[PDB]
Amino acid sequence: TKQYERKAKGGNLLSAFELYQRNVGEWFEMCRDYIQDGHVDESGIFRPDNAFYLRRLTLKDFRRFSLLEIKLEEDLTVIIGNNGKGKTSILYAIAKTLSWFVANILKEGGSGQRLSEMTDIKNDAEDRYSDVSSTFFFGKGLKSVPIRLSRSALGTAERRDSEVKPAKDLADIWRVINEVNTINLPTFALYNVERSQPRREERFDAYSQTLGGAGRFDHFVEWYIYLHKRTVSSSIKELEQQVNDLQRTVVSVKSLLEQMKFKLSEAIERNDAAVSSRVLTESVQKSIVEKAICSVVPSISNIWVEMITGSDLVKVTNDGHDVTIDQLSDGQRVFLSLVADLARRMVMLNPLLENPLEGRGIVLIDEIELHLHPKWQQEVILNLRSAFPNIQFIITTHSPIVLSTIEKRCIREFEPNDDGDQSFLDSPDMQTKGSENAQILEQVMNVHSTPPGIAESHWLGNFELLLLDNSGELDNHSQVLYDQIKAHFGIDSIELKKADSLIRINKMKNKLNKIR
Amino acid sequence: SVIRGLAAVLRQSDSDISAFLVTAPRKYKVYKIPKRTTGFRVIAQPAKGLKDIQRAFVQLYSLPVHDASMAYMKGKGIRDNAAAHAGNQYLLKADLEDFFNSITPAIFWRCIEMSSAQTPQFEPQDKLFIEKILFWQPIKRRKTKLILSVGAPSSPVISNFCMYEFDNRIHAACKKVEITYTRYADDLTFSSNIPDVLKAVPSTLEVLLKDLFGSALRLNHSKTVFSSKAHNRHVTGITINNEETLSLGRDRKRFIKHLINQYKYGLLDNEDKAYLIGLLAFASHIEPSFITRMNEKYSLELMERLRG
RNA sequence: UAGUCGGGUGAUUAGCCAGACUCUAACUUAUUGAACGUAUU
DNA sequence: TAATACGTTC
Numbered sequence: 008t009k010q011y012e013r014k015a016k017g018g019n020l021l022s023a024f025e026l027y028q029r030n031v032g033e034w035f036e037m038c039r040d041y042i043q044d045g046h047v048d049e050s051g052i053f054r055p056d057n058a059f060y061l062r063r064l065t066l067k068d069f070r071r072f073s074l075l076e077i078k079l080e081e082d083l084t085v086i087i088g089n090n091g092k093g094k095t096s097i098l099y100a101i102a103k104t105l106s107w108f109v110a111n112i113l114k115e116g117g118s119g120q121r122l123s124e125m126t127d128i129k130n131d132a133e134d135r136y137s138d139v140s141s142t143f144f145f146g147k148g149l150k151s152v153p154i155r156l157s158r159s160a161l162g163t164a165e166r167r168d169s170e171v172k173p174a175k176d177l178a179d180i181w182r183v184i185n186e187v188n189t190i191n192l193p194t195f196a197l198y199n200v201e202r203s204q205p206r207r208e209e210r211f212d213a214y215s216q217t218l219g220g221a222g223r224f225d226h227f228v229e230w231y232i233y234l235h236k237r238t239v240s241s242s243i244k245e246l247e248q249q250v251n252d253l254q255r256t257v258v259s260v261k262s263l264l265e266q267m268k269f270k271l272s273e274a275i276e277r278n279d280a281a282v283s284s285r286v287l288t289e290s291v292q293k294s295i296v297e298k299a300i301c302s303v304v305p306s307i308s309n310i311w312v313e314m315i316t317g318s319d320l321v322k323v324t325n326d327g328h329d330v331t332i333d334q335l336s337d338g339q340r341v342f343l344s345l346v347a348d349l350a351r352r353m354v355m356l357n358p359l360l361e362n363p364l365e366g367r368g369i370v371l372i373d374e375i376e377l378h379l380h381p382k383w384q385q386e387v388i389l390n391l392r393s394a395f396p397n398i399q400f401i402i403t404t405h406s407p408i409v410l411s412t413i414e415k416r417c418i419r420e421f422e423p424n425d426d427g428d429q430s431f432l433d434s435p436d437m438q439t440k441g442s443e444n445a446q447i448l449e450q451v452m453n454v455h456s457t458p459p460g461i462a463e464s465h466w467l468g469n470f471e472l473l474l475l476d477n478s479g480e481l482d483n484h485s486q487v488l489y490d491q492i493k494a495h496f497g498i499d500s501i502e503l504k505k506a507d508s509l510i511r512i513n514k515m516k517n518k519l520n521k522i523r
Numbered sequence: 524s525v526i527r528g529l530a531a532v533l534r535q536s537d538s539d540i541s542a543f544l545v546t547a548p549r550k551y552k553v554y555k556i557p558k559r560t561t562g563f564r565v566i567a568q569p570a571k572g573l574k575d576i577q578r579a580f581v582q583l584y585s586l587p588v589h590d591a592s593m594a595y596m597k598g599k600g601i602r603d604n605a606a607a608h609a610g611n612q613y614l615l616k617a618d619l620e621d622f623f624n625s626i627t628p629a630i631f632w633r634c635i636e637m638s639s640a641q642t643p644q645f646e647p648q649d650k651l652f653i654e655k656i657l658f659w660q661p662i663k664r665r666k667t668k669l670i671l672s673v674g675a676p677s678s679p680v681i682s683n684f685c686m687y688e689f690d691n692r693i694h695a696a697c698k699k700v701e702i703t704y705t706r707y708a709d710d711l712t713f714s715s716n717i718p719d720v721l722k723a724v725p726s727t728l729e730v731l732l733k734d735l736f737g738s739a740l741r742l743n744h745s746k747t748v749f750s751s752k753a754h755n756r757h758v759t760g761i762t763i764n765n766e767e768t769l770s771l772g773r774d775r776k777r778f779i780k781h782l783i784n785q786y787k788y789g790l791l792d793n794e795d796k797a798y799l800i801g802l803l804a805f806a807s808h809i810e811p812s813f814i815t816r817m818n819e820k821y822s823l824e825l826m827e828r829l830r831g
Numbered sequence: 832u833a834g835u836c837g838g839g840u841g842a843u844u845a846g847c848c849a850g851a852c853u854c855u856a857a858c859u860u861a862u863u864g865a866a867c868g869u870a871u872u
Numbered sequence: 873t874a875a876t877a878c879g880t881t882c
């Protein structure tokens with residue numbers, strides 16, 4: 008219609024797509040350009056003209072939350088709070104919403120996941136239903152993609168319907184345009200705490216178990232060895248001719264013939280394979296993943312497959328030493344698995360990008376510090392945004408060490424006294440990036456730098472009060488406590504130095520007071 | 524009595540009005556209208572005979588309407604609605620869910636009972652006929668569910684009436700804290716020059732809605748939006764600029780200019796020309812200064828030729 | 832910094848030029864019905 | 873068991 012034509016010419020993606028579906032080459036090209044156009048910035052990073060991210064989330068009578076509103080950052084949002092504040096609940100809500108996009112990219116009218124009638128409705132909700140409302144952004148042509156997942160409690164008379172059509176409509180654009188001409192596709196992934204627990208490859212395997220079951224070490228190792236074996240050691244007609252020539256010669260050349268036959272079969276398969284499943288060579292895939300791992304994972308500089316010993320072994324250069332991957336801590340293994348899995352999916356879904364890791368997507372990570380030593384907590388987030396510059400990361404942490412590496416604008420904190428009524432999450436008042444750990448504990452996480460339940464933690468305070476009670480002179484009582492401090496903390500302790508300082512200052516103050 | 528009044532107005536017999544009303548809730552044509560993006564809107568319009576009755580009813584019975592109600596009011600429009608908020612820096616938009624279809628006979632009669640302003644009194648015998656006049660039966664087999672329809676001539680008047688007490692209370696509450704309030708059908712708009720005062724409004728609304736309507740009328744939380752001079756402010760499709768004046772918005776203006784340019788070179792078909800004329804008429808209503816500028820930019824002759 | 836507002840320029844929904852704004856914070860919508868503007872008479 | 877002069881809003 009003329010109205011759709013006007014809106015489409017104005018840059019509206021949905022109108023352009025509707026005109027394409029009713030009819031035609033011009034509208035197709037407009038849709039494809041909307042998805043594929045971008046530029047390389049000053050830093051040499053590809054940037055899509057039309058970014059895709061979650062803009063806002065609202066939770067109504069969901070689990071602990073009566074009504075909660077969250078505004079997310081385009082790049083990184085970190086959610087912090089005590090146990091039981093609902094950090095994992097937030098990620099679960101998002102992952103269920105994302106399941107509707109994944110289902111519909113894979114199949115027309117595919118069904119996503121649903122809220123549980125047994126567990127997900129707030130237990131003391133008067134109106135016995137729950138809503139998860141999300142708004143997504145996809146460039147200036149599609150500023151708002153609203154989705155609502157709803158569920159009514161068991162045995163309630165009126166059922167509340169989920170509203171998922173906008174998700175389906177957007178996912179349809181990706182699916183249909185990709186079917187005609189290969190495009191890059193968005194990555195959706197959830198890595199929950201279960202990551203820690205101990206056919207030929209095809210493009211849309213990248214969506215398999217992406218929102219639960221992702222990031223598992225054994226899957227990586229198997230995949231990596233497989234790729235190595237295939238990539239150890241030309242036209243189809245030329246290859247066909249070479250195979251024919253080698254067959255005529257065929258005993259020492261038999262191994263070469265088998266290799267060439269395999270290469271020919273692969274070339275034919277690639278030739279036969281569809282536009283919707285277009286993929287980079289196994290050699291390239293391997294290289295990208297290796298670089299991702301080495302860039303992101305702390306203290307791994309190199310990774311490779313050895314078969315010299317007679318068993319297939321993945322080796323890594325860890326802190327300058329070549330070791331087997333089984334000699335890594337479980338913390339480092341789990342993190343390696345997460346990055347490898349993510350990189351693998353990105354390579355599969357972004358075949359047209361120079362750097363497939365510059366693709367679009369939303370990645371959710373629960374408890375990023377899981378099993379990590381403090382040393383590696385200080386490094387993990389620095390790396391991730393540099394390696395995946397267009398991914399929206401939504402993460403949860405307990406770690407002040409992690410928070411010391413992140414800007415306060417990326418942080419969303421629960422109030423410690425929040426009994427679930429609170430409307431909006433906000434950023435901390437103090438700047439965290441580059442700040443001292445002890446300050447983040449006190450100012451952001453509401454924890455004393457010394458344990459209040461330990462008596463020895465109060466001795467310096469008590470010592471000071473005794474000094475002040477005896478006009479600054481070291482009496483029998485103050486001496487006893489001084490000796491206790493010395494005995495407990497040691498001669499070179501900061502605590503004893505503070506005590507010594509107090510003595511010196513108070514002596515001098517008293518002398519001045521006497522010089523009246 | 525309602526029957527006798529209607530019969531007199533429509534110059535029909537009491538018997539033929541009564542007979543018609545027996546199945547009036549089922550005399551609605553249902554059709555789909557394309558949305559501006561993707562999908563369709565579903566409309567249920569009364570049959571001609573019923574429309575006439577509905578109009579007669581509205582003529583016969585004057586129902587109170589609050590001044591803050593801007594929609595379906597004589598001499599009030601989208602311009603007046605937007606203008607009410609133009610002077611304020613902070614803006615809150617709230618939306619009611621399934622507004623028309625949430626209004627039932629029960630709500631209507633409750634509102635009649637509650638209403639303090641001079642509401643018509645109806646005989647109990649007439650109540651059934653009134654329900655049949657004003658409310659549509661969406662499910663043929665479920666006789667028990669009557670609701671206001673989006674496309675009925677009476678629905679605007681009835682809906683405004685049902686919101687009368689709501690508007691009274693929220694207007695009074697807003698006045699105390701210097702908030703400007705207007706309602707355009709299901710769209711509630713709040714504006715103020717005081718920071719943070721608007722944050723309390725959503726909670727106030729939920730309580731009031733529950734108090735007056737229980738669970739029948741609810742806020743659309745996804746469509747509750749805060750705005751300021753830092754961001755785009757629009758009210759009923761009209762842009763409020765940073766100079767606190769009504770505007771068509773930059774994109775709409777540029778589009779009109781584009782169409783004028785095309786017309787100047789005889790590239791606009793008759794349909795597009797008519798469309799351009801409509802846009803200019805609308806522009807004249809919302810932003811007369813824009814028309815002046817276009818007249819200065821384009822040759823008065825061109826513009827006059829276009830408005831012929 | 833980024834987003835937003837829009838006076839000018841542009842075979843003109845683009846691009847470009849000028850000025851301005853910043854409550855944690857717009858996402859431009861729906862007819863034949865109702866109201867409003869314009870045209871016909 | 874809807875209407876058609878063209879726009880705008882719900």
Ligand SMILES: Nc1ncnc2c1ncn2[C@@H]1O[C@H](COP(=O)(O)OP(=O)(O)O)[C@@H](O)[C@H]1O
Binds near residue numbers: 093127
């Ligand atoms: N249906 C429910 N009703 C009320 N509270 C719930 C419900 N489901 C979970 N909770 C509460 O939610 C909290 C757990 O949420 P979770 O996201 O696991 O917190 P965390 O931030 O520790 O990951 C607990 O306080 C639990 O009691």
Ligand SMILES: [Mg+2]
């Ligand atoms: Mg009309």
